[PDB]
Design a protein around this nucleic acid. Structure first.
Ligand SMILES: [Mg+2]
Ligand SMILES: [Mg+2]
Ligand SMILES: [Mg+2]
Ligand SMILES: [Mg+2]
Ligand SMILES: [Mg+2]
Ligand SMILES: [Mg+2]
Ligand SMILES: [Mg+2]
Ligand SMILES: [Mg+2]
Ligand SMILES: [Mg+2]
Ligand SMILES: [Mg+2]
Ligand SMILES: [Mg+2]
Ligand SMILES: [Mg+2]
Ligand SMILES: [Mg+2]
Ligand SMILES: [Mg+2]
Ligand SMILES: [Mg+2]
Length: 148
RNA sequence: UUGGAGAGUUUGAUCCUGGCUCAGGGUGAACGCUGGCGGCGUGCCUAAGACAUGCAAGUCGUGCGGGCCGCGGG
């Protein structure tokens, strides 16, 4: 079936009379390596539940992302509030050029060759959301002349 | 169209802002520890401070008159 990757685990904290009491946040992308990716954020009182909870939501938030010989059809920039991802198509023999967060998303979508660059807040979460919305806005020639 | 990776650190925790710091590459280098050979580079970045000694620009007797020495006789 699909394939999972844990980009982010982190411990948060709330306060009460007595001290700090913790939660856990799991940021996990799930892909098909052939054009299906999803991103999910799952928060739970212990690490396994969250890691498992996020993979659930991930499977219910997928994007088409239409590959073209392993690369995306056009350059794209998306801002998710102070976070900014740039994606540029790249020829075959180049590789996936991305930091760890967008890499896990592109590599699970079957992107084999792309140029990326994060800008502004490189906050992993918001960068991950902005990478997903970037893929969500990918158009093809058949997509655009149908629109026109 | 051959080209673009980020991370640590302000909070109990969050998002943002922002500075500091790090991973890379480079040097006519220097310093420490260590040191086998070969090739090709390359070596006063400071006092354009001061310098012993030798050498780094001479050559033509097919321009000219001469002193010397050596070779053939007058
Ligand atoms: Mg499409
Ligand atoms: Mg902005
Ligand atoms: Mg942001
Ligand atoms: Mg910043
Ligand atoms: Mg940061
Ligand atoms: Mg500190
Ligand atoms: Mg403060
Ligand atoms: Mg602290
Ligand atoms: Mg910073
Ligand atoms: Mg020897
Ligand atoms: Mg000098
Ligand atoms: Mg000197
Ligand atoms: Mg002086
Ligand atoms: Mg001489
Ligand atoms: Mg002479």
């Amino acid at each position: 079936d699909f394939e999972e990757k844990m980009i982010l685990i982190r411990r948060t904290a709330r306060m009460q009379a007595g001290g700090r009491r913790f939660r856990f946040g799991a940021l996990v992308v799930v892909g098909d390596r052939q054009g299906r990716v999803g991103l999910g954020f799952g928060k739970a009182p212990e690490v396994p539940l969250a890691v498992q909870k996020a993979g659930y939501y991930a499977r219910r938030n997928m994007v088409e992302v239409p590959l073209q010989n392993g690369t995306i059809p056009h350059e794209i920039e998306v801002e998710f509030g102070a976070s900014k991802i740039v994606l540029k198509p790249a020829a075959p023999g180049t590789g996936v050029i991305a930091g760890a967060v967008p890499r896990a998303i592109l590599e699970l979508a079957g992107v084999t060759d792309i140029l990326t660059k994060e800008l502004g807040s490189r906050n992993p979460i918001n960068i991950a959301y902005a990478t997903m919305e970037a893929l969500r806005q990918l158009r093809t020639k058949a997509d655009v002349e149908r629109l026109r």
